[PDB]
């Protein structure tokens, strides 16, 4: 879940 | 039959007397904290030795591969030389070394898995000691307040 | 992993539980004694009224 | 002891902030592994702080 | 079994007595200061030997 | 040439085994420090700064 959150943050 | 029952009762009485003397939390807690760290260090040392052993095995395995390569070069040289005897010696050495290397690799893989598990266990152990250290401070604060109350109660 | 009596972790927990319960109980007992003495409590209330 | 506990609590908050900064740095770095370590540290500390 | 229990009590009593007796901030630090410097000198000697 | 139970040959082999073992032991201890994320992160930060 943390990795997914990190991935979401990364895209912008 | 009666004597055995009596011994148990005597043991219980003896145990009760002993615990009261050592009942206070602070003396026991400090000793326990020192002991767990020492135990962890011993475990770490053992793990380090195992890791070192694996490295040594890997080095030996690497050396064996290098030795095999050297033997192969000699075998190649023998063909150029045209002497059958030189070639025969090299072939025998290669076969035994390969078997030894395979055995070492299998042992190393099993060892590596154990080390990984040990590393995970070590991390958990490290987390536990830190939690215990935090608890003593909390324990100390409540205990001090209790002592103050007893003095207040007498008045 | 065993968490046996000989191990340090098991020993620390049992001693702590007994001490914590005993300490809390003693504090509670002191509070009860204060409650019993109504006159002392009444005096504090009177003082508060005087302060107001 | 209360002051020490408060100092420890303050230190924990500071430690959490430092961990958060590292987590933020990890996102900039783009390395998933750095981020994972920071998250684990934050959760245990928060629980400890609440208890304190 | 009784002896083991007794040993823990003895160890705890001994440990408690020991920490109080030897806890001096100035004395411990001075000894530590001497020790680290000595260790550095030994390291320097090894470095010197390597250089030699 | 033989590497026989001679006094000089035996000592060299034992010494060779000990140093290699010591290096491996040192590496294992070093590896644990290396494993921690913070040590690795600092090196990465330094490299980027150095390039700039």
Residue numbers in the entry:
A (entry chain P): 208 to 219
B (entry chain D): 1 to 155
C (entry chain J), F (entry chain Q): 156 to 207
D (entry chain SB): 53 to 104
E (entry chain E): 1 to 52
From the paper:
Proteins that perform these functions include Vipp1/IM30 in photosynthetic plastids, PspA in bacteria, and ESCRT-III in eukaryotes. Here, using a combination of evolutionary and structural analyses, we show that these protein families are homologous and share a common ancient evolutionary origin that likely predates the last universal common ancestor. This homology is evident in cryo-electron microscopy structures of Vipp1 rings from the cyanobacterium Nostoc punctiforme presented over a range of symmetries. Rings have an inner lumen that is able to bind and deform membranes.
